[PDB]
Design a protein around this ligand. Structure first.
Ligand code: NAP
Ligand code: DOY
Ligand code: DOY
Length: 316
């Protein structure tokens, strides 16, 4: 299994990255350092995770230790929803760059297609429990992302949580300057995303699978929710290959030509999660894992279902 995939900007993206959502500032510095030591070169970040300073410290530390070169790293961050206004995008990107102590990002994503009212608060809600949106739109936000490229702040731009119609909006944009390189979407055996993956891949857009382990630490988890890591059917697949359930869950997207970004702050797990280039899932295993699809989302953005750009009304 080649370790990197070719992007439409000529750059190569490692197919296995480290997630950092919910990684406490108290622990992510260690997490990243260990990740880099055991082979990870792609780190998935976001301003909204409010830990990019601590990620940056780890990277800086390992550059000065001479463990890795900036050029070998693929650092990804995302524009949060309260910064969709054209006038706010550069400042949002430069803040991320400053926190990460970098002078470029390899990839910068619009985190969600939905713009939220600008302000200090990351998720402003109204008295009905719905998000307070902003007067922004995807195309205008995209043009703002293009300038980041044209100014050298990021090497590639993409999108996250966009449905195929929203992607299409950008693709068909008059005066398009840069095609999206990546669409980062939730993907695992309970949400297999066949049609959206088909769509993106046919459009030369690389797909990154988030929550590949089913995000057991998601803050809104309910006891009765489906649990991938516990799923006895998947454990059985793992046992057969003498690997852990998580390793099977990370290898699965890899064999669908996806990028995958499992999150851990546990040093032992960070290392284990990377040990997935030494076995292959059988044709039967893949077919089987794909058959567990339930269209079940970790991240359904339920507070925004009335937003004009809410992505998950569409079938895909
Ligand atoms: N673009 C978006 O809107 C979006 C949305 C969600 C996620 N993402 C990105 O995708 C990453 C991955 O998704 P995620 O954080 O939702 O969840 P995930 O990676 O599916 O699951 C992380 C959970 O799994 C546990 N874990 C990791 N390795 C394990 C192993 N080998 N055995 C047992 N448990 C293990 C972690 O625990 P410990 O950390 O305590 O070890 C943590 O609780 C995020 O961190 C983020 O970078 C992007
Ligand atoms: O419902 C979801 O899909 C996730 N969800 C959010 O969308 C609601 C969000 C929120 C909570 C409080 C103030 C502002 C915003 S984040 C959240 C937290 C707990 C539970 C759920 C959420
Ligand atoms: O967007 C992600 O990558 C995950 N995620 C967050 O990082 C946003 C998080 C948040 C919500 C409210 C105040 C502060 C932070 S949780 C969340 C909820 C819905 C959707 C997404 C999130």
């Amino acid at each position: 299994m080649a370790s990197r995939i070719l992007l439409n900007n000529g750059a190569k993206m490692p197919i296995l990255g480290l997630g950092t959502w919910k990684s406490p500032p108290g622990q992510v510095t260690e997490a990243v350092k260990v990740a880099i030591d055991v082979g990870y070169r792609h780190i998935d970040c976001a301003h909204v995770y409010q830990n990019e300073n601590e990620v940056g410290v780890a990277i800086q530390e390992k550059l000065r230790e001479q463990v890795v070169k900036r050029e070998e790293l693929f650092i990804v961050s995302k524009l949060w929803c309260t910064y969709h206004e054209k006038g706010l995008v550069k400042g949002a990107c430069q803040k991320t760059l400053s926190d990460l102590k970098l002078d470029y990002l390899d990839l910068y994503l619009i985190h969600w297609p939905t713009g939220f009212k600008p302000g200090k608060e990351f998720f402003p809600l109204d008295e009905s429990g719905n998000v307070v949106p902003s007067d922004t739109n995807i195309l205008d936000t995209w043009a703002a992302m293009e300038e980041l490229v044209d100014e050298g702040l990021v090497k590639a731009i993409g999108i996250s949580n966009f449905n195929h119609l929203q992607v299409e909006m950008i693709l068909n944009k008059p005066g398009l300057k840069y095609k999206p390189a990546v669409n980062q979407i939730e993907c695992h055996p309970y949400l297999t995303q066949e049609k959206l993956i088909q769509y993106c891949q046919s459009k030369g857009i690389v797909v990154t699978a988030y929550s590949p382990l089913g995000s057991p630490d998601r803050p809104w988890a309910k006891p009765e929710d489906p649990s991938l890591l516990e799923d006895p059917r998947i454990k059985a697949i793992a046992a057969k290959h003498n690997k852990t359930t998580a390793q099977v869950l990370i290898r699965f997207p890899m064999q669908r030509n996806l990028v995958v970004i499992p999150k851990s702050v546990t040093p032992e797990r960070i290392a284990e999660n990377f040990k997935v280039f030494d076995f292959e899932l059988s044709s039967q295993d893949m077919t089987t894992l794909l058959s567990y699809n339930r269209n079940w989302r970790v991240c359904a953005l339920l507070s925004c279902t009335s937003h004009k750009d809410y992505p998950f009304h569409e079938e895909f």
